[PDB]
Amino acid sequence: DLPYGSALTSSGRISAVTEPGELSVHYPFPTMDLVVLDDALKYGSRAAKARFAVYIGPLGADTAATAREILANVPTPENAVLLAVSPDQRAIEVVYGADVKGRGIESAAPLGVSAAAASFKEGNLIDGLISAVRVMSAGVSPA
Amino acid sequence: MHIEARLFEILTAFFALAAVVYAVLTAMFATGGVEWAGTTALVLTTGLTLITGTFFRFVARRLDTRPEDYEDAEISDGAGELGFFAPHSWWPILISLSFSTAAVGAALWLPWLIAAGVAFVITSVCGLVFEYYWGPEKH
Amino acid sequence: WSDALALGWPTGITPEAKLNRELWIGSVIASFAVGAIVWGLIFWTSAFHRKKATDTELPRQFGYNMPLELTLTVIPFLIISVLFYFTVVVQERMMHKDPNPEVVIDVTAFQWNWKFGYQKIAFADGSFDYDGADPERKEAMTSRVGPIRGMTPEDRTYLNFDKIETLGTSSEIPVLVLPAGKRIEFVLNSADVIHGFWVPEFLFKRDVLPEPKANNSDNVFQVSEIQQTGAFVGRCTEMCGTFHAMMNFEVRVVEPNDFKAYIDQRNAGKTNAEALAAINQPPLAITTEPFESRRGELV
Amino acid sequence: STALTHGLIGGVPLVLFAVLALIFLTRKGPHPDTYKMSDPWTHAPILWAAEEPREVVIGGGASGKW
Amino acid sequence: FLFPDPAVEHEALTEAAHASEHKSLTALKEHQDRI
Amino acid sequence: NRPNMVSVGTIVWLSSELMFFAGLFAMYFTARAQAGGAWPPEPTELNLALAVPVTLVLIASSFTCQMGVFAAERGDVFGLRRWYVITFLMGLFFVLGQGYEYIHLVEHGTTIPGSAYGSVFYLATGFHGLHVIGGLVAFVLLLARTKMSKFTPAQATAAIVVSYYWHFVDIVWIALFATIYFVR
Amino acid sequence: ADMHRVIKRKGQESFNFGELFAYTKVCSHLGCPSSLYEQQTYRILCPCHQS
Amino acid sequence: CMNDIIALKFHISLNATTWIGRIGMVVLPAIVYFVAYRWAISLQRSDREVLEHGV
Amino acid sequence: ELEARRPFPERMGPKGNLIYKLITTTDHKLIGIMYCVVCFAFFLVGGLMALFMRTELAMPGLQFLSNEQFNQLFTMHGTVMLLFYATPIVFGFANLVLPLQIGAPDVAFPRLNALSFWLFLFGALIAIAGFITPGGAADFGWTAYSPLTDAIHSPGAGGDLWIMGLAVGGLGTILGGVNMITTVVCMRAPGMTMFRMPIFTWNILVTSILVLIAFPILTAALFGLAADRHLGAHIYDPANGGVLLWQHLFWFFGHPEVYIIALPFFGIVSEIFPVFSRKPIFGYTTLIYATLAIAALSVAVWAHHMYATGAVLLPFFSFMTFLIAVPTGIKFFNWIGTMWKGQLTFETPMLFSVGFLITFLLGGLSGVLLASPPLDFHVTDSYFVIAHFHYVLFGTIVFATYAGIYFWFPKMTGRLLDERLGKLHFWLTFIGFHTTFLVQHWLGDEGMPRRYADYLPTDGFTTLNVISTVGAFILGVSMLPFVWNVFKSWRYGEPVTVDDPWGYGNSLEWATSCPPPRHNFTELPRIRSERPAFELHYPHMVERMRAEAHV
Ligand code: HEA
Ligand code: HEA
Ligand SMILES: CCCCCCCCCCCCCCCC(=O)OC[C@H](C)OC(=O)CCCCCCCC[C@@H](C)CCCCCCCC
Ligand SMILES: CCCCCCCCCCCCCC(=O)O[C@H](COC(=O)CCCCCCCCCCC)COP(=O)(O)O
Ligand SMILES: CCCCCCCCCCCCC
Ligand SMILES: CCCCCCCCCCCCC
Ligand SMILES: CCCCCCCCCCCCC
Ligand SMILES: CCCCCCCCCCCCC
Ligand SMILES: CCCCCCCCCCCCC
Ligand code: FES
Ligand SMILES: [Ca+2]
Ligand SMILES: [Cu+2]
Ligand SMILES: [Cu+2]
Ligand SMILES: [Cu+2]
Ligand SMILES: [Mg+2]
């Protein structure tokens, strides 16, 4: 079931390969936009002492139960604030753990949804994610 | 480690043959006779490979097969402590700065700078050699 | 065409030079053939063994072809054995010395000009004899216990002094005058560091050493004859300091009777330039001119 | 000449650089094209998280659409 | 530097040194814990 | 069950350091071939009444060094210290004896600037003497380290490789002494 | 041979006696004897602060 | 202040030593400030490493 | 199966991440990177020297340089390119990958390794500091012939600084050789037998043996030269036999030297060809034998540099020099056989290795021409020799060095260099090199000697000199895309999250992450051949590899 050229090693790690001249990562966004989003995540999380996360993919039919399922994959999920987006279903969800409750996220999470939605209507996915992370982390205190 | 010894013994055979051939061929029909610089260099290149090969050959016949000498050894044969490998040190750059001080002193022929550089070298080399052997301070 | 294959080698003006040029052309052709084969093999696999779009499995994983490995060590050995044989033949012919040269020249290199002395002339037909050695001046150099076999390093006795000498100057290129058709012997000594005696039309050069005998250098070489008259540049070919690029000389090859007239003029007290004008030659060097003594265009 | 010598030495390198950089740097690199919202999301699902702070009762959430 | 002392002397000295070092560390530690 | 890594590194380096003396031997033999029959030339009068005892002291320092190695391999730090102190004293005696020979040679007109023989004699024997001084520094540093912690196998390995260096220096001296004082 | 390179100061054009010139040995910076006279460069160097 | 002694002993032009001092008087303190700042923070990180992982 | 990742990997470490590491590190990976950076800075400095020389040689007459400055320029250009760029970058590459290739966590002596690097850096700085003296740097050539180098003929402090800087750096090189040999004989992983090691490791080991022969005798010769220059010694006195004493000693160093900076780079292309051919290396055992034969022979051919001195036994050295051509041709046949019937893709490492093959071939043919004393009697000390050794050097330490950099940059950094910019870099380098150096064969054959600051308009040399200078300035601009690529790719390059970005790597470094952890390996595979990473990543092929191995 392992991809071609991938091997399970004696430590349990996977030793994988790429064809020469091909890429390992291949996210459909420009490198400098990815760097901007990475900085938004890092410095928003540092300023709020809560781990901010972003999901892109299919959110199902309820799309909030699925988002709560995805939040379990963020490290220390009790202290995390996930923004999940379905470009197809055109759905925006924010879900956070219990550690963040009462720290300013009830005011800021809908503001993050609005910030994302405004940029999505222009067809700017990564710009919407960056703006939403910026507003939600600026509204959470390290409490 | 028989291959390690064999490599140096093969080099030794070639170097000894080259030294003998060169000395004999320059003694006969070469102006001035034996060419002493090249003959000396070839003889002592032979000596270099001979010293290392004899040491390896003596070591090989002592210890039985290591896991890196064994054609179908398992990775787990090599389990255990390897040895001590220094995690960090700023003494190497101090030793090189000291030796460079003495070298600049010798280049410009400043005997006081040469003396200072040699003293720096001895202090830096002591610092390196003692780094993992100084005990706790005593009070 | 022999000029394109010679790659800028001069045609040569001595028999030894012509033999060396033939060896050069043959060796160039051999190396070009080997290079064409190897380059073609590189271009072939680069052109026809590139990964296609319709190959899913890896190529055949061969890594050993023993008969081919053995066959590809014998052929280059054969080519270098042939080249070594002809190399030995030509160097034996080029380094050959006859016991009776017809002109013996003393070449003295110094930093950074040349001095040419006429040591001896013995024409093969008896039409010209001249004894030019001046041993009453080699003895004036004796410096004498001494650091080296009783001698100080200022001994200089190994240098040769002659009655007729052409001395180079920063404003006059030294012109060495030689007869055509005659066996010429060159004895090379340096006054200080190592220089290089290169006449490109000789297709040959040798290093000019201080104290060559103590260094086991053979400082003597001959050309069997120079096959045409004319003027030929010579350059220093061993890095000797500041003015290594600016100590050139010229060889003027004239007919033997004109050489005799030139030597009579020099024996009559004439300088090199006026003795050359006396035999209807240009008085100064014509392949090269003196370098401006200004250190450059910014001065 | 002397102006031709300086024209060649200065000019040939820059012309050659411009030509080779037009040949090679105008090609498309291996980086994927940027996803367009009007197109379907055919990539694998992506989960990004910040590594800070250095190291499951839900506390709430919000929803939205666009 | 050149000759060993009797082993009993070495043992007693080493034990005393270790006990003294431990007592000094403990004194500093308990003062720190108190304050 | 495995090679002593420090030992192999030391042996490899010592074999390289043989080439350094190869250069100096080449200088000596080149100057000797150009001697012209007088080697050593006047006024150099080598005396074996003093070179021989100094050579013998340096040779006996090898046996004392080997005794120290046997003590170290036995785990006996005090026997190692005693034998290495003796070896240090004997090598220091060699250095002083060489210096006295140098002083008496200089007064009679054999110097580095003075003659080609003086140049080769002094570079050869003086670089060997510098190697001896480096080995004495090595003894001092090793002996100080044995006072710093308990005597472990790594400490004994350090003693062994210092002895490898000392034996190299002694053998190089035997070669230099044979070629200078007997193959004149 | 160097007299054609001499530039005179205004008011001092006749202060030299032919090829003899006389300047104060006191440095105008801070008063040290500025007396390191380089004859080929014609440079007067002050040992104190390198004027 | 010792530029003339340094010029004599270490084969530097005296004029060059003056200009090295003049430019270095601005440049060397800036370089040293930057290096010392980064070096101090680097020692702080070296301490942190031992605190999380031991010796 | 959602694993949280970052949108982009961290561009740089925080403040204070690097500076204390640089001065305290015993990590061979960091030391190798430090070697590569510093050696490349020295390469740029030496290239600037060559650009000055080439600009002055474009026209007859001295336009901006004097004779003295030009002589310093070729002396120091040769010194910097040979001893401050190529020789230490051998140990830069060895530090980068050799412990990985044998499956070790470290080199045998980590602090000695750090000392070797710092000795390189400070010795090189001591030699280059001659340029800040009034007289200037050494101006007697990189070969430093006697008696031109004696206190009478080269009095300046530049020459003495050159001597002592070379001595300090040479000690660094010797200690590096000791370390590399000891690492290979002691730190191999279980099952990594001597005849399963990669060819690069074999070549590093044999090169280290060569280092232990050549550099100590050069150190002895330099100390004799310093004794003459400072103490009035007579070592290199002409009446004492000193001219050829110097030449014999120097070339006994100087020939081994040129193969110290050839065999490691042969090993680099031996690593690269099988990956991009999707094939094994052809004749693995024969390649090892060829390396050993070349190393043995390179110690017995030195006087082919002395043909025109009239004082060496010509047939001995001529025959030995011809013999060296046989194992090198074996290497050329082994490399073409590795490519033969593969699936070639020509990414930047492969492209630079092919540039190696093409350029080195002409260099070696020219060298064989030089090996016969009669032809060397005309072409020695001329620009034919210059063309030869730039064809043969630039092939190993530029094309194979760049091949190693493009190959192993993802392994050492976790980022890929941009391949479009790499192709621009290759084609500028390849076109520029042949433009500057092919016409120098003709110039030397006509009669233009090496090491001339000036010539006359009537010499017939001007047009080819102009062409060579045009090519040299192409080589100058070829450096800009590479430096830009590394600067951009080091922080913003394509992330590498696999172990083998080139797909078909064979050596153990491709069986670990990009970059490796501090001690290089979180696990090791079973080692049963010289392609352990290939067998790890393609188990289904192992049977085929055993079946198809013999034609
Ligand atoms: C070993 C490697 C090596 C390398 C890579 C080179 C590289 C080059 N070399 Fe060579 N060279 C030698 C080794 C090497 N060299 C040796 C041993 C000698 C003999 C020395 C002696 O005579 O004693 C020699 C001598 C030599 C001569 C003969 C000089 C003479 O006899 O008079 C010439 C002639 O043109 C030449 C040219 C070049 C050129 C144009 C490059 C091109 O690679 C260089 C162009 C490259 C650049 C890199 C330009 C710099 C680019 C920049 C962008 C710099 C800008 C910024 C800064 C500098 C901070 N060099
Ligand atoms: C990387 C560096 C390097 C390498 C690999 C070489 C390799 C060789 N070199 Fe050279 N050389 C230098 C660097 C190098 N050299 C330098 C720097 C100088 C000048 C020093 C100075 O004076 O400044 C110099 C000078 C030099 C001289 C002295 C010339 C002179 O000054 O007068 C000679 C002469 O014998 C020589 C010859 C050779 C030969 C025969 C090889 C051989 O090893 C090459 C063998 C390769 C081939 C032959 C090609 C492959 C073979 C085949 C495909 C099979 C074909 C079969 C046949 C032809 C039979 N070179
Ligand atoms: C920055 C120092 C170097 C700057 C000066 C050179 C900066 C380098 C770039 C311009 C110099 C060469 C381009 C112009 C060429 C020319 O036409 O000649 C100009 C001058 C008329 O001739 C010279 O000879 C210049 C000096 C030579 C350089 C000595 C090398 C010094 C050693 C340093 C490498 C030590 C580390 C650096 C030390 C870094 C700082 C120390 C804390
Ligand atoms: C040079 C003195 C000569 C003495 C004659 C006998 C030689 C052996 C002496 C043994 C010394 C023991 C020191 C010791 O254990 O104390 C150690 C402390 O000394 C040192 O760490 C530095 C020693 C001096 C370094 C040498 C520098 C120059 C070398 C001179 C080269 C000739 C033990 O300290 P500790 O007990 O751990 O507190
Ligand atoms: C005809 C005499 C020649 C004898 C050969 C000399 C061999 C060189 C010996 C080297 C010395 C090392 C100490
Ligand atoms: C005046 C005629 C010149 C002919 C030049 C010959 C071309 C040489 C071939 C170049 C080598 C290709 C690799
Ligand atoms: C010219 C006569 C030959 C002299 C022989 C010199 C050989 C010296 C070797 C010494 C080696 C001693 C161990
Ligand atoms: C093995 C040597 C190859 C040399 C080829 C040189 C070709 C140079 C072409 C220039 C033509 C100028 C007239
Ligand atoms: C990639 C091409 C590099 C080779 C350039 C060859 C230049 C030869 C021109 C000869 C000019 C005739 C005088
Ligand atoms: S007193 Fe003259 S410069 Fe200061
Ligand atoms: Ca010019
Ligand atoms: Cu000359
Ligand atoms: Cu010259
Ligand atoms: Cu060579
Ligand atoms: Mg020559």
Numbering used by the authors:
A (entry chain V): 15 to 157
B (entry chain T): 1 to 139
C (entry chain Q): 27 to 170, 182 to 336
D (entry chain U): 2 to 56, 69 to 79
E (entry chain N): 502 to 536
F (entry chain S): 20 to 203
G (entry chain M): 320 to 370
H (entry chain N): 391 to 445
Sentences from the paper on this structure:
Here we resolve the functional dynamics of the 0.7 MDa III2IV2 obligate supercomplex from Mycobacterium smegmatis, a close relative of M. tuberculosis, the causative agent of tuberculosis. M. smegmatis lacks genes for a soluble cytochrome c and employs instead the QcrC subunit to shuttle electrons between Complexes III and IV, thus making the SC assembly necessary for its proper function. The SC also features a C-type superoxide dismutase (SodC) and subunit LpqE, both of which are anchored to the membrane by lipid modifications.
